[PDB]
Design a protein around this ligand. Structure first.
Ligand code: AGS
Lengths: 66, 244
């Protein structure tokens, strides 16, 4: 029953680990930090300055209307 | 019957054997956390005790992590011996028991004996059905209520914990436990510093904080209060305790 065992044991893995809270888990996985979900701000204008030795700025418009 | 205890003691992890071996254990697919060498030795002793069809008491000192020892024994039993599926608990520690089961051995199905009368009947129905669960966790109150109803299902192993601090436990309940159809039984006792060379370090500090000038002024004000001098010398406990 080792094949059946592998099957429902992996299912049990998914079920049980989904109960824990990203802590309490011995294999403390790294760098979750759940970032923001952004969630709407309608149409937006993004100002993005990056290092490329050099610095560049990209202005993104969400839609063609703006 | 004493031969069982003699054999268990012969293999028991005494102090020297509690640390002096290098059994190159591999992690059963269920288990995840790394035990101590001494907890690994306890795991090996439990596995041998079950393998030789023996019932034994956990003679380890109190506070050394019996939960993980039982969890790792369960993992090794299920993997090596293939007995893929009971624990008796008192109170909230039912939650801790299942939490540690899910933590160290998340691959085992868990059955919880908490619910309403309708929910408890449904839990019973699911508990009699095949391949429904692997580990059953129950409260001592439920066990006493279902002293005989628990007799219906047969078990690979059974664990008793916290009984020593449970009111109402009686020799008749022990007789029922023996009547329970667990091919092997385990008993946890806190009174059967220990094994500290591999336990957590627990570094403790105290640092001296010089009183601020304001604090010193207030301190000497409260001391010099003539009422406080009178109370200090008189020894009146309530007054001196107020000053303190
Ligand atoms: N370095 C370690 N030192 C002590 N315990 C550890 C260590 N690594 C893992 N553990 C175990 O990790 C588990 C986490 O603690 P808990 O399980 O919540 O407490 P507990 O040991 O179950 O309390 P008991 O057994 O009912 S007295 C314990 O089983 C510990 O023995």
């Amino acid at each position: 029953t080792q094949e059946e065992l592998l099957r429902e044991a992996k299912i049990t893995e998914e079920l049980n680990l989904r109960s824990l809270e990203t802590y309490e888990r011995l294999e403390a996985d790294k760098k979750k930090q759940v970032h923001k979900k952004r969630k709407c701000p309608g149409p937006i204008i993004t100002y993005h300055s990056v290092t490329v030795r050099c610095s560049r700025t990209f202005i993104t418009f969400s839609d063609d209307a703006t | 019957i004493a031969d069982v205890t003699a054999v268990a003691e012969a293999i028991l992890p005494k102090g020297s054997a509690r640390v002096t071996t290098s059994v190159k254990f591999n992690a059963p697919s269920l288990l995840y956390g790394a035990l101590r060498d001494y907890q690994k030795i306890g795991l090996d002793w439990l596995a041998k005790l079950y393998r030789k069809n023996l019932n034994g008491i956990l003679a380890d000192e109190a506070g050394l992590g019996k939960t993980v020892q039982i969890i790792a024994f369960f993992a090794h039993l299920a993997c090596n011996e293939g007995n893929w599926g009971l624990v008796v608990v008192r109170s909230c520690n039912i939650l801790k028991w299942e939490l540690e089961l899910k933590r160290w051995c998340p691959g085992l199905k868990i059955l919880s004996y908490i619910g309403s009368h309708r929910e408890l009947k449904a839990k019973r129905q699911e508990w009699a059905e095949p391949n429904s669960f692997h580990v059953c966790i129950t409260s001592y109150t439920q066990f006493f209520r279902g002293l005989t109803a628990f007799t219906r299902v047969r078990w690979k192993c059974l664990v008793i914990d916290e009984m020593q601090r449970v009111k109402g436990m009686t020799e008749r309940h022990w007789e029922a436990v023996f009547t329970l159809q667990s091919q092997q039984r385990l008993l946890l006792i806190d009174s059967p510093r220990d094994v500290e060379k591999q336990l957590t370090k627990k570094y403790e500090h105290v640092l001296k904080c010089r009183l601020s000038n304001r604090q010193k002024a207030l301190y000497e004000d409260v001391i010099l209060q003539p009422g406080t001098q009178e109370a200090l010398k008189s020894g009146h406990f309530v007054n001196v305790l107020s000053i303190l």
